[PDB]
Design a protein around this ligand. Sequence first.
Ligand SMILES: NC(=O)[C@H]1CCCN(C(=O)[C@@H]2CCNc3[nH]ncc32)C1
Ligand SMILES: [Zn+2]
Length: 139
Amino acid sequence: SGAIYVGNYRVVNRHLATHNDWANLVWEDSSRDLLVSSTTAQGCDTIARCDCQTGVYYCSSRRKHYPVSFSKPSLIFVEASEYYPARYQSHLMLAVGHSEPGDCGGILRCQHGVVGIVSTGGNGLVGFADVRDLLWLDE
Ligand SMILES: NC(=O)[C@H]1CCCN(C(=O)[C@@H]2CCNc3[nH]ncc32)C1
Ligand SMILES: [Zn+2]
């Protein structure tokens, strides 16, 4: 679990969105595994606006942060799960690292701010849904 709170928005993995998230829906994209809902309380996370390929992510299944090198956002094949059929997930970045189901939502950060959130795992890889292209999150 985990979310990004920036301005009047809450960013979460679409497969983990709640009833309240869907009742206050702003934007969702099944191909990216992202959903943004509106909030009443103001958020203070900073979104990175960059092309960094190194950062640190929080891994809840180890209660640790790990430094990683990660790929640029791209369409990557993701195995079928109970939430989606087998498909290409877009705007996904992979790194070598630990990620098990409950790790989704863990933030990936570089020196400039929030880069994205954990969205996939398995086979010793961790995939992060990028949020750096969502320029409207700040306006
Ligand atoms: N974005 C998606 O389609 C994800 C939907 C939930 C299931 N997915 C996974 O990869 C999980 C997530 C955490 N890591 C992990 N390690 N082994 C399996 C898994 C795919
Ligand atoms: Zn950066």
